[PDB]
Amino acid sequence: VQEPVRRVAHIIREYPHATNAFTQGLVFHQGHFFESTGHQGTLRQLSLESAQPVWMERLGNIFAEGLASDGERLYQLTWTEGLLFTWSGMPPQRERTTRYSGEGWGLCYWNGKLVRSDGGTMLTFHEPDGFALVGAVQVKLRGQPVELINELECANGVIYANIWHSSDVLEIDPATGTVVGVIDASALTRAVAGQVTNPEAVLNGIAVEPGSGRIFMTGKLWPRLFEVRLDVVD
Ligand SMILES: CCCCCCCCCC[N+](C)(C)[O-]
Ligand SMILES: [Ca+2]
């Protein structure tokens, strides 16, 4: 038991993002870059050369939320609807609708399981086929539960998680819920501050590219998505 590692996200490069996209899910999938939005609900494939998506399916009034990939299918939560959409093929088409209890904030895939956050302190673990709960951990930083756990990303042996309305990103051990790292991504929030006005225009959305290990972060309604390098601070 030691101090969580402290890191600072250093902006490597910036790319256009759409200022009308409320980013709730962000993941790489079968060579492409995907985003889930609510208000209005969409699944979109992003270009890094333009804010205009290369492909989008509109979900109407459904408030879509976190988005996970197992390499073959995309899995997409909803906020209070209790709907999980499972997408397959290229372009993705929905092949399954699944009802679940509780709220859907972030989602990622780890060790054959979907890991789900709901804005509380808990990460719950679910079977991809039918979304039955199989386990849970409480997310704890220095032994203390952390509320507001939002978009997820399963990479590098951890779960990366946004904290809603914070510029910190946690690194969580999925076996235990222990926070093993805290990333300061406040340079990203500072970077867009002169351009965003909406109260909900907050850092959210982490995706790691499988083929390159390159790490990307954005925010709701942000004009930019950022590639970051995570530097240890001592
Ligand atoms: C112009 C007003 C925009 C209202 C936005 C409401 C965002 C709800 C976000 C919920 N969650 C944290 C669950 O996504
Ligand atoms: Ca993600």
Strand order in the sheet with 133-138: 107-110, 113-116, 122-126, 133-138
Tell me if 79 CB under 6 Å of ligand 1.
yes
Decide whether any atom of ligand 1 lies within 6 Å of the 95 Cβ.
no
CA gap 34, 180 in Å, rounded: 27
Number of other residues whose CB lies within 10 A of the CB of residue 125:
18
> What is the structure's resolution, reported in angstroms to one decimal?
1.6
Tell me which residue range forms the domain holding 206: 1-234
From the CA of 105, which ligand is nearest? Answer: 1
97, two tokens: 């609708």
Q: How far apart are alpha carbons 206 and 226 in whole angstroms?
A: 10
- d(CA 19, CA 209) in angstroms, rounded, equals 23
Domain count, the chain: 1
Length of the chain, in residues: 234
> With contact defined as beta carbons under 8 Å apart, do 185 and 9 qualify?
yes
Q: How was this structure determined?
A: X-ray
Best residue among 148, 164, 165, 221 to mutate for probing ligand 1, ranked by most atoms within 8 Å of CB: 164
Q: How many CB atoms sit inside 10 A of residue 198's CB?
A: 10
Longest Cα–Cα distance of the chain, Å, equals 48
Listing DSSP states for 124-171 in one string gives EEE-TTT--EEEEEE-EETTEE---EEEEEEETTEEEEEETT-SEEEE
Going from the Cα of 69 to the center of ligand 2, the distance in angstroms, rounded, reads: 9
